[PDB]
Design a protein around this nucleic acid. Structure first.
Length: 75
DNA sequence: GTATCCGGATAC
DNA sequence: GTATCCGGATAC
């Protein structure tokens, strides 16, 4: 178990992101990144992330393939 | 029972 | 047509 859990500053402390290069079947070869909340919540995408954070807390600067906030805020 | 992963579904 | 997110299923 434990494929590769890496930190995820795209949200805050506690968050963890992982990479999944498929395993087989038909979709084999695709890479899916899964990340768990910072203290209790399984999110598999940005929407799921926007859920535990609230609908008003959008995440357009969050990378679904990396799990990081490339840019914090403009002004 | 847990855990991972596979596959597709939907959307306008 | 593409893109993204979700869900369940299986596994032993």
């Amino acid at each position: 178990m434990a494929e590769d859990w890496l930190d995820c500053p795209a949200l805050g402390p506690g968050w963890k992101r992982r990479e999944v290069f498929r395993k087989s079947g038909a979709t084999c070869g695709r890479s899916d990144t899964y990340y768990q909340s910072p203290t209790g919540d399984r999110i598999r995408s940005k929407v799921e992330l926007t859920r535990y954070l609230g609908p008003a807390c959008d995440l357009t600067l969050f990378d679904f393939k990396q799990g990081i906030l490339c840019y914090p805020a403009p002004k």
